[PDB]
Amino acid sequence: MIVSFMVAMDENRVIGKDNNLPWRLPSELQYVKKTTMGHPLIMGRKNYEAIGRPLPGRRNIIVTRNEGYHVEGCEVAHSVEEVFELCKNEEEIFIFGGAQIYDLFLPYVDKLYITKIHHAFEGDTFFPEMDMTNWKEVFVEKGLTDEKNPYTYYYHVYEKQQ
């Protein structure tokens, strides 16, 4: 049906600014999570491991390959092979995976979002604007600084054909 993917974009990195990804409008995260609470969320064990997170969306699913392994506090998922079909399991599904994951999830994603932040230093995953022609933007929204977020950022809407 509809596959949504959420990914950030560090001005000096790409996603891993410092073992984890930045954050903005901590309030919006609650409103959306409360209204979406129940939607499937796919994330990488590496990112979920460093960050941890309790149970945002009451459906935190981490993709990891290791038979006989189980992570308490989160659901275990298989490679994109499983997620591929799991998609048809729910109308609108959210995917996060990570850097490498997003790459292979390119043909599996229908609509993607990118958030460019003007703040990043020494991280784990760096990848500046090298090639994004594969995608086609349709809308772009700007953000604004704040007390909890003294950093300026911008929201972008990426859409695919398939």
* SS3 of residue 106 by DSSP: coil
Contacts of range 82-87, beta carbons closer than 8 Å, 24 or more positions apart: 83/42, 83/108, 84/108, 86/40, 87/1, 87/3
Site for ligand NAP in 84-123 (CB under 6 A): 96-101
Choosing from 4, 12, 20, 152, the residue that interacts with ligand NAP (CB under 6 A) is 20
Provide the β-strand partners of residue 9.
116
Residue 17, marked binder: no
Q: Which residue is nearest to ligand NAP (CB)?
A: 98
20 marked ligand binding residue: yes
Residues pairing with 112 in the sheet: 5, 158
**Residue listed under structure tokens 């149970």:** 55
Q: Which of ligand NAP, ligand N22, none lies near 30, with the C-beta cut-off 5 to 8 A by kind?
A: none
The answer to whether 57 contacts ligand NAP (rule: CB under 6 A) is no
Burial-class residue 100 by CB neighbours within 10 Å (0-12, 13-18, 19+): exposed
Q: What is the largest CA-CA distance in the chain?
A: 46
Q: Is 108 annotated as a binding residue?
A: yes
Q: How far is the CB of 58 from ligand N22 (least distance, A)?
A: 12
> At 101, phi and psi to the nearest 5?
-60, -55
| Residue 51 C-beta: closest distance to ligand N22, Å | 5
**133 annotated binding-site participant:** no
In this chain, which stretch among 14-22, 85-93, 127-135, 140-148 interacts with ligand NAP, using CB under 6 A? 14-22
Q: How far is CA 146 from the centre of its chain?
A: 22
Question: Using CB under 6 A, which of 30, 55, 73, 79 touches ligand NAP?
Answer: 79
15 binds ligand NAP (CB under 6 A): yes
Question: For binding to ligand NAP (CB under 6 A), which residues are involved?
Answer: 7-8, 15-16, 19-21, 44-47, 50-51, 64-66, 79, 96-101, 124-125
